[PDB]
């Protein structure tokens, strides 16, 4: 089955989900949340099943299904699978554009006791429950930008369609305990939010 | 309630078996069929069979055919997939979904169980590619990086073009290497690309012929 | 800690400047690194230049940042370049030049191997080069109808000549390779599209 | 003209050493200093040291002492830099860059080398991170994927978030494990992270504390 790579919109843009090359009858949709089991969402054509929203319908155009959302609510985004007998399709990357977003939270910690007794040293800047996913992470000694020994992963779903992303320094135990303060600044749509760790 | 209770995510070496356990209550278990569908390392859902649980008859599809086994115990109202020998491109989240007769209303798809299948060091299978023209070879499902492509022991190195690797589904690395030549030597003088992967130890040569 | 920005564009005449936040007064170096081969130096110390540069490149400081003017972007003057106090260098400016000869793709397919069909493996080479900018789009076809599953397409990157590569690889099963009548590669850059076509012979 | 022509590229196991030489050409070899620098995959030129040809002496960063020697044959006006241990950072491009008079004017870098070091199955290295309050588990440098952590065997799983692993510099992977638990038993009951790397065959227990 041939379906769209990826669909955009709005809450309200009602975007419809193409299903070509199916046969007639005996078509089904599928609504997959990563991290959970998919759903059933059209039973046969247009059919829905009991406890669904009615805002998910279905129609045929005799070669070619497809899915209409009356409203593109903001709980409403997954991947699609429309599925004629044993057979899926692509999959929709449905996405959407009009979401609320969502400040950062930030968590650092300082390298732990353990680890600096094997002359090792790194700190742990972890970030989650933000939208959309581009964060910039800049690390600062004393005011100091550092750029040195710095990976921050890409932003990855979370169960809660949130984004979250980890951002780790290294560092030898020396430079590590000559600063005063060690800074994760993270800036998530102009607005940044900074955690410090000292060596106490 | 109609509940699906699968297994534990679990991590395979390659060659490894892995059962996944789908316990289904809340419904009479023998009067749906239990299907497996996969869902690929961030690809679309793969369909994998069928399992009639009243029965015990099966259906595969094409490409997973002698190596999945499905079976039902149905003293506990369970379903089992087996996966035999397992490659790097089984790697997938694994779920079972109840249905009945012609149609595909699968209502309930249960939680999921994700099988991991790590890469393992492994050399390349080169293989050649026949053809002012163009030949080479392919440096296939190799892991990790890097390989060494060398032509002729190295005596020959005009117009060679190493491409970069492509990292496929599988987590295995992929390489093509080519040489242009003129058409008129193509029967003339052979023609030898030797690959080496130092990590898994492997140094072969392979011959490229029309 | 020497902070240079992370990349500039230009373009022929665009006279762009690179700054050098954090140095020390006096020694300042200029590095010029076209990957590949060695960096060359381009500032001795702040504003002096070694013989045979071009004049084209020339270097200031404004009282605590170092800065590196160019006249003019020439086509050719795209690399990292570092400024250096002492023994630590910059992070790396990417200069990127634009309004570079766009140059169309080729392509080169290949069908799978005697050898590699003896195993029950089937894997089809669609090899592009020479083309510029480094963006394209890679579509196979099997007898006129786009296949999608089993694609796996590498981003294109730098060559020795300036410009970009991309290899893309079809993994089929030795049955759909001969069962269809062709598959094609398909490369679609700046609105012009090269497509190669290859059959079970 | 003044040349300076330096080793083939090598690819290195870990714990391996590397030799790159560097002949000069040109230029008496004894009357300028000279250093070698890094540029480390996709980072910055990195000062390893520099040797003087005339007398021997060696200067190294504070980062390589202990693991860096250079040394230098006259005969040839050669100088050769050695890296012993090769860790998964050690892949880079190896520049031999001669030195006009002191201070640090740099003149030339002949041409680079490349000297990669694959990466080899590795054990995670586990720590705690100390701290309603949040405490989890550090793994660190482990390949390849996956890892997998369980608190309190299994027993603790509300409020527990594993953030996905971070592809670093040299090639391996480091993950996080944090879970949320309240202030008031910090002091009270111990949280015990359990990871296993299936890959290394490594399965260890950390206790988290404050």
């Known amino acids: 089955l041939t379906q769209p790579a990826s669909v955009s919109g709005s809450p309200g843009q009602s975007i419809t989900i193409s299903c070509?090359?199916?046969?007639?009858?005996?078509?089904?949709?599928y609504q997959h949340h990563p991290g959970k089991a998919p759903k059933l969402?059209?039973?046969?054509?247009?059919?829905?099943?009991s406890g669904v929203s009615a805002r998910f319908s279905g129609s045929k155009s005799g070669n070619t299904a497809s899915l209409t959302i009356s409203g593109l609510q903001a709980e409403d985004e997954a991947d699609?699978?429309?599925?004629?007998?044993?057979?899926?399709?692509?999959g929709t990357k449905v996405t959407v554009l009009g979401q609320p977003k969502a400040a950062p939270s930030v968590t650092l910690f300082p390298p732990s006791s353990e680890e600096l007794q094997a002359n090792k040293a790194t700190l742990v800047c972890l970030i989650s429950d933000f939208y959309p996913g581009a964060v910039t992470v800049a690390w600062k000694a004393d005011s100091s930008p550092v750029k040195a020994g710095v990976e921050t992963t890409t932003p990855s779903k979370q169960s809660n369609n949130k984004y979250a992303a980890s951002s780790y320094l290294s560092l030898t135990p020396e430079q590590w305990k000559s600063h005063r303060s060690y800074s994760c600044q993270v800036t998530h749509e102009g607005s940044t939010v900074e955690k410090t760790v000292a060596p106490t | 309630q109609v509940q699906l209770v699968q297994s534990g995510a679990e991590v395979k070496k390659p060659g490894a078996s892995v059962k996944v356990s789908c316990?289904?209550?809340?419904?009479?278990?023998?009067?749906?069929?239990?299907?497996?569908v996969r869902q690929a390392p961030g690809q679309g859902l793969e369909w994998?069979?069928?399992?009639?649980?009243?029965?015990?008859?099966?259906?595969?599809?094409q490409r997973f055919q002698g190596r999945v086994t499905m079976t039902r115990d149905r003293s506990i109202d369970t379903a089992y997939m087996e996966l035999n020998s397992l490659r790097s491109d089984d790697t997938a989240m694994?779920?079972?979904?109840?249905?009945?007769?012609?149609?595909?209303?699968?209502?309930?798809?249960?939680?999921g169980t994700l099988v991991t299948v790590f890469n393992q060091i492994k050399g390349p299978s080169v293989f050649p590619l026949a053809p002012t023209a163009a030949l080479g070879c392919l440096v296939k499902d190799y892991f990790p990086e890097p390989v060494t492509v060398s032509w002729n022991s190295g005596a020959l190195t005009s117009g060679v073009h190493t491409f970069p690797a492509v990292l496929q589904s599988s987590g295995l690395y992929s390489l093509s290497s080519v040489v242009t030549v003129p058409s008129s030597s193509l029967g003339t003088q052979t023609y030898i690309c030797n690959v080496n992967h130092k990590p898994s130890n492997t140094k072969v040569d392979k011959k490229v012929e029309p | 800690a020497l902070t240079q920005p992370a990349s500039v564009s230009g373009s022929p005449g665009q006279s762009i400047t690179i700054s050098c936040i954090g140095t020390?007064?006096?020694?300042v170096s200029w590095y010029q690194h076209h990957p590949g081969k060695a960096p060359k130096l381009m500032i001795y110390?702040?504003?002096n230049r070694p013989s045979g540069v071009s004049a084209r490149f020339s270097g200031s400081k404004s009282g605590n940042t170092a800065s590196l003017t160019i006249s003019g972007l020439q086509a050719e003057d795209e690399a990292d370049y570092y400024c250096?106090?002492?023994?630590?260098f910059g992070t790396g400016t990417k200069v990127t030049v634009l309004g570079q000869p766009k140059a169309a793709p080729s392509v080169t397919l290949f069908p799978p191997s005697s050898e590699e069909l003896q195993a029950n493996k089937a894997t089809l080479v669609c090899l592009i080069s020479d083309f510029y900018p480094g963006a394209v789009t890679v579509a196979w076809k099997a007898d006129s109808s786009p296949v999608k599953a089993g694609v796996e397409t590498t981003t294109p990157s730098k060559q020795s000549n300036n410009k970009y590569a991309a290899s893309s690889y079809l993994s089929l099963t030795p049955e759909q390779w001969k069962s269809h009548r062709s598959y094609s590669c398909q490369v679609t850059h700046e609105g012009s599209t090269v497509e190669k076509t290859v059959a079970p012979t | 003209q003044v040349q300076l022509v330096q080793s083939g590229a090598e690819v290195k196991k870990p714990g391996a050493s590397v030799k790159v030489s560097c002949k000069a050409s040109?230029?008496?070899?004894?009357?300028?200093?000279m250093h070698w620098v890094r540029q480390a995959p996709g980072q910055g030129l990195e000062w390893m040291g520099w040797?003087?040809?005339?007398?021997?002496?060696?200067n190294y960063a504070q980062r390589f002492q202990g693991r860096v020697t250079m040394t230098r044959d006259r005969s040839i006006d050669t100088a050769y830099m050695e890296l012993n241990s090769l860790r998964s950072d050690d892949t880079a491009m190896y520049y031999c860059?001669?030195?006009?008079?002191?201070?640090?004017?740099?003149?030339?870098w002949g041409q680079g080398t490349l000297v990669t070091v694959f990466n080899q199955i590795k054990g995670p290295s586990v720590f705690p991170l100390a701290p309603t309050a949040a405490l989890g588990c550090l793994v660190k440098d482990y390949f390849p994927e996956p890892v997998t952590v369980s608190w309190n065997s299994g027993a603790l799983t509300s409020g527990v978030h594993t953030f996905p692993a971070v592809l670093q510099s040299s090639g391996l992977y480091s993950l996080s494990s944090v879970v949320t638990v309240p202030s008031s038993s910090l002091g009270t009951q111990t949280y015990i992270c359990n990871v296993n790397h299936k890959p290394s065959n490594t399965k260890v227990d950390k206790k988290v504390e404050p």
């Open positions: 040109g230029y008496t070899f004894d009357d300028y200093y």
């Open positions: 020390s007064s006096d020694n």
């Open positions: 040797m003087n040809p005339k007398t021997g002496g060696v």
């Open positions: 860059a001669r030195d006009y008079g002191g201070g640090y004017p740099l003149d030339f």
């Open positions: 110390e702040v504003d």
């Open positions: 250096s106090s002492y023994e630590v």
